[PDB]
Write a protein that binds this ligand. Structure first.
Ligand code: DRB
Ligand code: HEM
Length: 406
């Protein structure tokens, strides 16, 4: 079963053995599988003995509160189990303010709204190229053919890196979250650093207007950013916008493929696309990381112990029936779409603006060229669960005669 012995300070009545890496009824959909944590018989805050043992906040109120309170809930160990969150070094994911603030401001210079607005049409040009290449085929595995190539190519654009480096960079990042065995996490991480360091050092001396140049020439605490800090920052800027976007776009397209009326709504009402993007972000939320207790702390009537890890599923806030009525229903016209899909608090996703642009551009450009599409006949879509939950594959089909080259 792989259950760790219940710590003495944890009450038995709060035990609920949820496995974030293999939840029951995953076949019903990953968001639905996690939603079991919100059924009436489950407390607001529970302890699971799976994956080493850890707390799980199941309601939006608690999830938000914990993310706001970095003093008690530290990012030093954000992953479960502990012997993975202690190893990882990317900046500034494992830092708490004030330390985190300096690096966060610098990162915002490369992915902030001003930059996203400026690269807006370049992202569109990339989406159109990928979609046009698939259009005549009448079929594709959305995840492999569009979802994966899109974000990585956008990173190359952002970081001013050559297209020829994509296959290798993609492989290195793939090994960090989906290893085939050729490389350990440390080896993949170091391989990434071996690639980034030379570029960082060269652009420190002869800078451009790209993301790496900006980070390399950044300042931290009155002095210049070190090579170690720069590579760790660039590393997160790379990995942060890959799996999240790949899987999110896949969840969204899976829904649209199965929902003809929703596709038509966006075709007839293009102005609703941004709102649709927000509603999809709520319904198909997919991240679930955590924090570690800095000291003994009583939280909502529960005794938390220093060193205890707590999973705070960003995914769950928007699915909470206390926040949004009929949470499993996708309604593009909701007046108030509440969610913490991009996180909450000091670590709120720095790439949130880039992500929304990628989503909106994908939706508009795909529906413009391929308005009518469906899940391939006989195909059964499978999901996966973890820190970033997702879709294994998404075989889509369409009649080329119903499409149009634009
Ligand atoms: C290669 C790899 C990774 C890996 C992880 C990684 C993490 C995650 C921590 C390290 C991952 C780091 C991600 C880096 C990228 C990144 O930072 N993205 C960012 C970005 C996007 C979101 C949001 C924020 C911005 C923060 C972050 C996430 C957590 C657990 N394990 Ru699992 N694991 C971990 C350590 C030691 C052994 C081990 C095993 C052993 C056997 C079988 C499984 N595992 N493992 C794998 C699949 C399913 C279950 C599973 C378990 C289950 C229980 C116990 C161990 N293992 N494992 C294995 C290989
Ligand atoms: C749909 C897509 C995305 C989702 C759902 C998502 C979600 C998240 C979440 C939940 C966090 C905070 C985690 C925590 O509090 O520990 C986060 C952090 C971050 N994300 Fe994203 N993200 C997305 C896209 C992107 C993109 C496109 C980039 C581009 C580089 C990116 C860069 C980052 C960075 C650098 C951080 C760290 C912020 C900090 O620690 O201060 N993300 N993201």
């Amino acid at each position: 079963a792989n259950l760790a012995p219940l710590p003495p300070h944890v009450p038995e009545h709060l035990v609920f053995d949820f496995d974030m890496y293999n939840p029951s009824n995953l076949s019903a959909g990953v968001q639905e599988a996690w939603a079991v944590l919100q059924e009436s018989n489950v407390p607001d805050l529970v302890w699971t003995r799976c994956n080493g043992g850890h707390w799980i906040a199941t309601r939006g109120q608690l999830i938000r509160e914990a993310y706001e309170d970095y003093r008690h809930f530290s990012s030093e160990c954000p992953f479960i189990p502990r012997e993975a969150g202690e190893a990882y070094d990317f900046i500034p994911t494992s830092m708490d303010p004030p330390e985190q603030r300096q690096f966060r401001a610098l990162a915002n210079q490369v992915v902030g709204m001003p930059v996203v607005d400026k690269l807006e049409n370049r992202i569109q040009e990339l989406a159109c190229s990928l979609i046009e290449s698939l259009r005549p085929q009448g079929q594709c595995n959305f995840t492999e053919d569009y979802a994966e190539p899109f974000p990585i190519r956008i990173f190359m654009l952002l970081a001013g890196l050559p297209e020829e480096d994509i296959p290798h960079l993609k492989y290195l990042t793939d090994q960090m979250t989906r290893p085939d065995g050729s490389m350990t996490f440390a080896e993949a991480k170091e391989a990434l650093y071996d690639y980034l360091i030379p570029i960082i050092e060269q652009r420190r001396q002869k800078p451009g207007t790209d993301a790496i140049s900006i980070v390399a020439n950044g300042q931290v605490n009155g002095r210049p950013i070190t090579s170690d800090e720069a590579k760790r920052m660039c590393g997160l800027l790379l990995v942060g916008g890959l799996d999240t976007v790949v899987n999110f776009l896949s969840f969204s397209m899976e829904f649209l493929a199965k929902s003809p009326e929703h596709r038509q709504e966006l075709i007839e009402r293009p102005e609703r696309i941004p709102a649709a993007c927000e509603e999809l972000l709520r319904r198909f939320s997919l991240v679930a990381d955590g924090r570690i207790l800095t000291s003994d702390y009583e939280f909502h009537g529960v005794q938390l112990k220093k060193g205890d890890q707590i999973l705070l599923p960003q995914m769950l806030s928007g699915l909470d029936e206390r926040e949004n009525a009929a949470p499993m229903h996708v309604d593009f016209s909701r007046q108030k779409v509440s969610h913490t899909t991009f996180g909450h608090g000091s670590h709120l996703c720095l790439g949130q603006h880039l992500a929304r642009r990628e989503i909106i551009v994908t939706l508009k450009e795909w529906l413009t060229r391929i308005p009518d599409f469906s899940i391939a006949p006989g195909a059964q879509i499978q999901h996966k669960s973890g820190i970033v939950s997702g879709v294994q594959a998404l075989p889509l089909v369409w009649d080329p005669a119903t499409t149009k080259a634009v």
